[PDB]
User: Fold Macrophage migration inhibitory factor from Homo sapiens.
Amino acid sequence: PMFIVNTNVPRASVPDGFLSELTQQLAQATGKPPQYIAVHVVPDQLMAFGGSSEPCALCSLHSIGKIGGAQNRSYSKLLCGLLAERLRISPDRVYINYYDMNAANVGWNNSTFA
Amino acid sequence: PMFIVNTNVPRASVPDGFLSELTQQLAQATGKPPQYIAVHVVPDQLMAFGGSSEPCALCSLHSIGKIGGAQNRSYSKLLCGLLAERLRISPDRVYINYYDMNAANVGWNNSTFA
Amino acid sequence: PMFIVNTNVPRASVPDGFLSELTQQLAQATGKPPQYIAVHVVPDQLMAFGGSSEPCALCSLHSIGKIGGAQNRSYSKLLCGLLAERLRISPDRVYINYYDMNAANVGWNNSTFA
Ligand SMILES: CC(C)c1nn2ccccc2c1C(=O)[C@@H](C)N
Ligand SMILES: O=C(O)/C(O)=C\c1ccc(O)cc1
Ligand SMILES: O=C(O)C(=O)Cc1ccc(O)cc1
Ligand SMILES: O=C(O)C(=O)Cc1ccc(O)cc1
Ligand SMILES: [Cl-]
Ligand SMILES: [Cl-]
Ligand SMILES: [Cl-]
Ligand SMILES: [Cl-]
Ligand SMILES: [Cl-]
Ligand SMILES: [Cl-]
Ligand SMILES: [Cl-]
Ligand SMILES: [Cl-]
Assistant:
């Protein structure tokens, strides 16, 4: 799986260890091997949520399977929790787009997962 | 709705009020409340369009519904118009990917919209 | 079509002419004219792959058609090859998401491709 967070929070406010924490927490939530998990954090962005530039985040989680109604609610609680605790972003100023990818549409190591 | 613009135009060339104008115009266009609209502008990017690095933009609009043939043509006219007027980007150097998101696949506020 | 590469490798390590090389190689691979190919490279990113901050890349290729099982395997070999040779990123630390876009969902030049 791949998790991306884009935020207007400045780089200095992203605490040490954040990428590792995301990796560990996502491995456990998705059930996928930790070696599979990619994480990407993009601070200092020019963004607004509801017209306001108070701290906010726009995120995505791509996975081959492990995406669905109940699973996505669980991921959102986990991820909003982390963004609130670590980046001080209110959960109501976070969007997360979930993508269930077909194995044939994910390239890795010169080939695909298909 | 979430709207993202990635561009090679420099930050100083993004005028005051641009995020607010996008928020307002997208609210009117999508029929969604502005409180729900997120906008994200990413200037100073290393990009090429059609084999040149003249001003260009790669964008996305995600919405739960309000996506379709005629609607997307209307959004493109609106958004290319704004990018041309405000960022001086030629409409023929803009791509906008449209995504009709299922409510279960959009996380917000510790849950999803499902 | 549109190709995006996000990577932790430094900007200075991206060779002069890399964008043009991607443009031409993708034109040949997809059979699409170079005038329609957009490329976007984002260096110096805060990212991890398998919990490791060694060089890695997260990429996407969007195309109207020319996406599928065999084609994506071929694109993956091509693109991992280029990232390895030019950016010194190991293929086993690259993900590429493939998207077959409907023409109605791709905006361009005040309209869509539909
Ligand atoms: C092909 C599949 C098993 C696989 N996918 N994948 C994605 C990211 C990191 C490692 C791996 C991995 C492996 O365990 C090596 C042994 N091929
Ligand atoms: O679309 C909506 O109804 C909304 O209010 C929010 C939204 C957030 C993210 C996204 O990818 C799509 C919609
Ligand atoms: O889920 C798996 O098995 C992966 O290898 C993860 C993954 C899923 C979707 C993506 O867009 C990127 C990576
Ligand atoms: O496939 C084509 O015909 C294209 O015009 C290139 C393209 C395809 C999909 C995109 O999201 C962006 C550009
Ligand atoms: Cl589920
Ligand atoms: Cl539930
Ligand atoms: Cl898919
Ligand atoms: Cl429509
Ligand atoms: Cl129409
Ligand atoms: Cl969806
Ligand atoms: Cl194919
Ligand atoms: Cl589509």
The pocket of 3-(4-hydroxy-phenyl)pyruvic acid (ligand 3) is lined by residues A 1-2, 32, 36, 62-64, 101, 106, 113; C 95, 97 (CB under 6 Å).
